[PDB]
Design an enzyme around this catalytic site. Structure first.
Site, PDB file in Angstrom:
ATOM      1  CE  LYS A  38      -0.330  -0.471   4.906  1.00 34.85           C
ATOM      2  NZ  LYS A  38      -0.479   0.893   5.437  1.00 34.85           N
ATOM      3  CE1 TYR A 267       8.564  32.827  -4.634  1.00 34.35           C
ATOM      4  CE2 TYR A 267       8.725  30.493  -4.092  1.00 34.35           C
ATOM      5  CZ  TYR A 267       8.386  31.499  -4.980  1.00 34.35           C
ATOM      6  OH  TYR A 267       7.876  31.178  -6.213  1.00 34.35           O
TER       7      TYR A 267
HETATM    8  C1  LIG Z   1       8.721  31.301 -12.453  1.00 36.00           C
HETATM    9  C2  LIG Z   1       7.285  31.276 -11.905  1.00 36.00           C
HETATM   10  N1  LIG Z   1       6.350  32.065 -12.458  1.00 36.00           N
HETATM   11  C3  LIG Z   1       5.095  32.094 -12.037  1.00 36.00           C
HETATM   12  C4  LIG Z   1       4.678  31.289 -10.981  1.00 36.00           C
HETATM   13  C5  LIG Z   1       3.216  31.376 -10.548  1.00 36.00           C
HETATM   14  O1  LIG Z   1       3.131  32.106  -9.340  1.00 36.00           O
HETATM   15  P1  LIG Z   1       1.969  31.872  -8.257  1.00 36.00           P
HETATM   16  O2  LIG Z   1       1.603  30.461  -8.046  1.00 36.00           O
HETATM   17  O3  LIG Z   1       2.528  32.568  -6.922  1.00 36.00           O
HETATM   18  O4  LIG Z   1       0.758  32.792  -8.799  1.00 36.00           O
HETATM   19  C6  LIG Z   1       5.613  30.458 -10.369  1.00 36.00           C
HETATM   20  C7  LIG Z   1       5.177  29.657  -9.308  1.00 36.00           C
HETATM   21  N2  LIG Z   1       6.028  28.973  -8.562  1.00 36.00           N
HETATM   22  C8  LIG Z   1       5.959  28.982  -7.084  1.00 36.00           C
HETATM   23  C9  LIG Z   1       4.570  28.525  -6.624  1.00 36.00           C
HETATM   24  P2  LIG Z   1       7.289  27.891  -6.449  1.00 36.00           P
HETATM   25  O5  LIG Z   1       8.599  28.551  -6.435  1.00 36.00           O
HETATM   26  O6  LIG Z   1       6.893  27.306  -5.004  1.00 36.00           O
HETATM   27  O7  LIG Z   1       7.311  26.657  -7.465  1.00 36.00           O
HETATM   28  C10 LIG Z   1       6.936  30.447 -10.840  1.00 36.00           C
HETATM   29  O8  LIG Z   1       7.892  29.646 -10.288  1.00 36.00           O
HETATM   30  C1  LIG Z   2      -2.849  -3.864   9.150  1.00 33.08           C
HETATM   31  C2  LIG Z   2      -1.373  -3.620   8.807  1.00 33.08           C
HETATM   32  N1  LIG Z   2      -0.485  -4.633   8.817  1.00 33.08           N
HETATM   33  C3  LIG Z   2       0.797  -4.445   8.526  1.00 33.08           C
HETATM   34  C4  LIG Z   2       1.297  -3.182   8.199  1.00 33.08           C
HETATM   35  C5  LIG Z   2       2.797  -3.076   7.878  1.00 33.08           C
HETATM   36  O1  LIG Z   2       3.582  -2.469   8.951  1.00 33.08           O
HETATM   37  P1  LIG Z   2       5.208  -2.488   8.818  1.00 33.08           P
HETATM   38  O2  LIG Z   2       5.517  -1.687   7.468  1.00 33.08           O
HETATM   39  O3  LIG Z   2       5.937  -1.967   9.990  1.00 33.08           O
HETATM   40  O4  LIG Z   2       5.570  -4.031   8.516  1.00 33.08           O
HETATM   41  C6  LIG Z   2       0.399  -2.110   8.186  1.00 33.08           C
HETATM   42  C7  LIG Z   2       0.825  -0.825   7.852  1.00 33.08           C
HETATM   43  N2  LIG Z   2       1.675  -0.125   8.578  1.00 33.08           N
HETATM   44  C8  LIG Z   2       1.751   1.336   8.377  1.00 33.08           C
HETATM   45  C9  LIG Z   2       2.282   1.653   6.970  1.00 33.08           C
HETATM   46  P2  LIG Z   2       0.090   2.096   8.650  1.00 33.08           P
HETATM   47  O5  LIG Z   2      -0.581   1.312   9.883  1.00 33.08           O
HETATM   48  O6  LIG Z   2       0.348   3.593   9.137  1.00 33.08           O
HETATM   49  O7  LIG Z   2      -0.799   2.083   7.467  1.00 33.08           O
HETATM   50  C10 LIG Z   2      -0.945  -2.337   8.489  1.00 33.08           C
HETATM   51  O8  LIG Z   2      -1.843  -1.315   8.474  1.00 33.08           O
END
Ligand SMILES: Cc1ncc(COP(=O)(O)O)c(CN[C@@H](C)P(=O)(O)O)c1O
Ligand SMILES: Cc1ncc(COP(=O)(O)O)c(CN[C@@H](C)P(=O)(O)O)c1O
Ligand SMILES: [Cl-]
Ligand SMILES: [Cl-]
Ligand SMILES: [Cl-]
Ligand SMILES: [Mg+2]
Ligand SMILES: [Mg+2]
Ligand SMILES: [Mg+2]
Lengths: 386, 386
Positions: A38, A267
Site C-alpha cells: 500500500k 522566497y
Molecule cells: C517562475 C514562476 N512564475 C510564475 C509562478 C506562478 O506564481 P503563483 O503560483 O505565486 O501565482 C511560479 C510559481 N512557482 C511557485 C509557486 P514555487 O517557487 O513554489 O514553485 C513560478 O515559479
Molecule cells: C494492518 C497492517 N499490517 C501491517 C502493516 C505493515 O507495517 P510495517 O511496514 O511496519 O511491517 C500495516 C501498515 N503499517 C503502516 C504503513 P500504517 O498502519 O500507518 O498504514 C498495516 O496497516
C-alpha cells in the site's frame, strides 16, 4: 520508459528480494508472508515490489483500499490480495469480480452489501479484530455476535482469514503489546465459541515478526522491513539480521553560480550569503514530496554533506557548496555517496516525522528506476501514463 | 472514472474560471495570462485546470519540467507551454518535437544542446533573468554576453520570451520587490545593448499582478490566485477582488465506535480517551498527503469542528466526535460545512507551512471530481491509469 528531468528514485530489487528471503528463512516454514504494498509500495511502486516479493517467497499481497489492488490485478498479478483499510459496501461486487479480499467487520456493512449484491458474485473477507490499535475492527463479544448474525443473510460473503494489528511492537518495553496479544487470544476464543473456524490467522507487522515468539500464526504482514528499513530507531539494535535499504533518491546540479556576499536566496529572502558563495540549484521540491521543513537539512554532493539554503520551492531547492562542481553533478537526498549515507530515518528525524512518511510521500511525478543485479531492468514514469 | 474509496478532492471549475476571468478583466487588455499548472496543477490536476483556464481567457500554459508539458500535449492541448524550471540539455529535441518551450539561460546548456541536437528540430526558449530570487537565471552582464555568444553556434534555438520572478511580492513592505524591478530593467538594458529584442516579457506572479503597476509587461504568470487562494495572509486584505477557492478535500466516516475511558488510539498510544468517547475512523492518511503533523487539527463533521486524535496512519486517521453519527457521514478536511470553512491556509498554519504545499501534495492516489455549474462533469482517478 522516458523521463525528462534528472531527478529520480532508485529501487534496488536485490535488496527487497534479500529482505523477503531473510524474513522467510527467519520465520517458520509453514508461515506465509504478505507483501504489504500500500501507499505505492511505501513509495517504491506497487507492481515491481509485488513482483519481486512474490519471487522471493511471499505468497500474498496487502493494500490499503480497492483501487490499489486493481493496479496490481491489471499488471497481471494473480496472487491473493487483501485490502487492510476500510471499504465502502459499494465495493462488494467489484472486489469479488477482481478476486480481491476486503476487511469486513461491521453488521452495517453486511446489511448494505446484501442490498448492493449483484446476486452472483462471491467475495472473500478477513475479519479485523481491534485488540488495542483503536483504528478499525471488532472490539467486543456482543459486537462480534451481531456481526456473525448479519452474515447469516449474506451467504455470498466467505471468510478467508482473521487478523489484528499491533500498535506498539516497535517500542522496546512490551506491556501494551502483551495486552494486545492476550486480548486477541480472547477474541479468537469468542469466534470458537460462536462456531467459526478462523481458517487463516495473521497478526504480525515487521517489528512483531522480527522480535517475538508466538505471534506468527499462519502468516505475517511485512511492509517496512521488506523495504529494508527499521520500524523504529529504538528496536534497531535488537533486529535479528541486517536490513538492506531498497530506496534511494537522487537529483543533479541544474545550475551553479557564485553569489556575492549579502545577496538573498529564494522566497522571503530567508537566507543571505555571508561571503561570495557557490550556490547550486536542483530540480526537486515540495511538489515531489521534499518538503519546506527540510530547509537546512544536508544533502550529499561528491560525498560531502552540504546544507539546503533558502526556502524549498515547489519544484526546486538551493544548496550552499564549499566549491564549484560541474553541471550534472549527482546530488543524493536519500542514499550513499562515498563514506556518507543519508537514511529515510535521518530525513524523518530532521522533519519531525518517521521514515514511513518520508518514503511514501515521494510524489508520483518522480520516476522510479529499478535495479536488479547491478543493472537497470525497468523504469516507471507515472506521468507518462496519466 | 470509477474510484472505490470514499475519499476525494472536489475541484470547482466555475471558481477557477471566475478567478481567471476576474484577473483578465483586472489587467490591461494587451496582457496575456499564463495558467501555471505545475505540481499537478497545484493538486487540482494538470489537464482540467489547463482546459478551464484557457476557456476563461488564459492563452498560455506554464509547467515545472518537460514531462508535465507532455501530459498536457497528450490530452490534445495545443496552446503554448513554457517549462519554468531547469531542464537537462538532452531535452532539446523532445521539447522541440512537442512544441514545448524551455527556460534556457546557460552557455553550457547551449554547448551541450549543439552536441545533442538532431539536426532538424527548432526549439523555442525563454531567458530567465535572476533579479533576486537566487534560484535559476542569468544574473550578470558578462554572463549574459557569454550566453548570447554560445547561441551564435545554435541557430536551432530561437527566443520566444524573457522573464524574471519575484521573491517577496507577497510581503506588504516592498523594498526588495522594488530592487528586483530595478535590477530587471538593467538586465533588459543589457539585452538591448547586445542587440537582442526580448520579444515577449513577463515578470509577475499572482501577488505581483494583483498588487503593483508597471509589472504586467506582455504577460503575467498566475498560479495560486487562479486556484482561488491568497499568496499570503498578510496581503490578503489588500487584494483587489474576492478570490474563489476551487479545491476541497473530503472523506466519509468508515467506522464509528464507543471507546471506554482510558483506552488508547493508534500507534504508540499517544491518545487515550478521558471518558467513554465516540471515535470515528476515516480512509485518508499520510500516503495521501494528509501528514502526521496534522494530529490534533480539527476537521469538519456535520458542520462541527472535531479533533484528529492519535497518530495519523498511512491510509487512515481517527476523530473524537461529541456524538454518534452514521457510517458514510461526510468529513471535510478542506472546504465548507454549514457556517464552518477550513481553508488550505488554516491547514498550512497548523502544519507550519503554506497553502501551496498543502494543496500540491494531495497524492495522485486521491481521485479528483470536477464540478461545473453545480454538476459533476468529470472524474479523474490516476490509479486507474498506471
Ligand atoms: C517562475 C514562476 N512564475 C510564475 C509562478 C506562478 O506564481 P503563483 O503560483 O505565486 O501565482 C511560479 C510559481 N512557482 C511557485 C509557486 P514555487 O517557487 O513554489 O514553485 C513560478 O515559479
Ligand atoms: C494492518 C497492517 N499490517 C501491517 C502493516 C505493515 O507495517 P510495517 O511496514 O511496519 O511491517 C500495516 C501498515 N503499517 C503502516 C504503513 P500504517 O498502519 O500507518 O498504514 C498495516 O496497516
Ligand atoms: Cl487495524
Ligand atoms: Cl526563477
Ligand atoms: Cl504600484
Ligand atoms: Mg443463529
Ligand atoms: Mg478494554
Ligand atoms: Mg453527511
Amino acid at each position: 520508459a522516458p523521463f525528462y528531468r534528472d531527478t529520480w528514485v532508485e529501487v534496488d530489487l536485490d535488496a527487497i528480494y534479500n529482505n523477503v528471503t531473510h524474513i522467510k528463512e527467519f520465520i517458520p516454514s509453514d508461515v506465509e508472508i504478505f507483501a504489504v504494498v500500500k501507499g505505492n509500495a511505501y513509495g517504491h511502486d506497487y507492481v515491481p515490489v509485488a513482483k519481486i516479493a512474490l519471487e522471493a517467497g511471499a505468497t500474498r499481497l496487502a493494500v490499503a483500499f480497492l483501487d490499489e489492488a486493481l493496479v496490481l490485478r491489471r499488471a497481471g498479478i494473480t496472487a491473493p490480495i487483501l485490502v487492510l483499510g476500510p471499504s465502502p459496501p459499494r465495493d462488494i461486487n467489484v472486489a469479488a469480480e477482481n478476486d480481491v479480499a476486503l476487511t469486513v467487520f461491521q453488521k452495517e456493512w453486511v446489511d448494505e452489501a446484501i442490498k448492493l449484491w449483484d446476486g452472483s458474485s462471491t467475495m472473500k473477507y478477513h475479519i479485523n479484530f481491534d485488540s488495542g490499535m483503536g483504528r478499525i475492527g471488532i472490539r467486543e463479544r456482543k459486537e462480534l455476535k451481531g456481526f456473525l448474525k448479519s452474515l447469516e443473510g449474506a451467504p455470498f460473503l466467505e471468510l478467508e482469514g482473521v487478523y489484528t494489528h499491533f500498535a506498539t511492537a516497535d517500542e522496546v518495553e512490551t506491556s501494551y503489546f502483551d495486552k494486545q496479544y492476550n486480548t486477541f487470544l480472547e477474541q479468537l476464543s469468542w469466534l470458537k465459541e460462536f462456531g467459526v473456524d478462523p481458517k487463516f490467522v495473521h497478526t504480525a507487522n515487521s517489528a512483531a515478526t522480527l522480535r517475538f515468539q508466538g505471534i506468527t500464526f499462519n502468516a505475517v504482514r511485512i511492509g517496512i522491513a521488506m523495504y529494508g528499513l527499521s520500524p523504529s530507531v529504538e528496536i534497531r539494535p535488537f533486529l535479528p539480521f541486517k536490513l538492506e535499504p531498497a530506496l534511494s533518491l537522487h537529483t543533479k546540479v541544474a545550475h551553479i553560480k557564485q553569489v556575492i556576499k549579502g545577496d538573498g536566496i529564494s522566497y522571503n529572502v530567508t537566507y543571505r550569503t555571508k561571503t561570495e558563495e557557490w550556490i547550486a540549484t536542483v530540480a526537486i521540491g515540495y511538489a515531489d514530496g521534499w518538503l519546506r521543513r527540510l530547509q537546512g537539512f544536508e544533502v550529499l554532493v561528491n560525498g560531502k554533506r552540504v546544507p539546503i539554503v533558502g526556502r524549498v520551492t515547489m519544484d526546486q531547492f538551493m544548496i550552499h557548496l564549499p566549491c564549484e562542481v560541474p553541471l550534472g553533478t549527482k546530488v543524493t537526498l536519500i542514499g550513499r555517496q562515498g563514506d556518507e549515507y543519508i537514511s529515510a530515518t535521518e530525513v524523518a528525524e530532521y522533519s519531525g516525522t518517521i521514515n514511513y512518511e518520508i518514503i511514501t510521500t515521494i510524489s508520483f511525478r518522480v520516476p522510479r528506476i529499478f535495479i536488479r543485479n547491478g543493472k537497470v531492468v525497468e523504469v516507471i514514469n507515472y506521468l507518462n501514463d496519466i
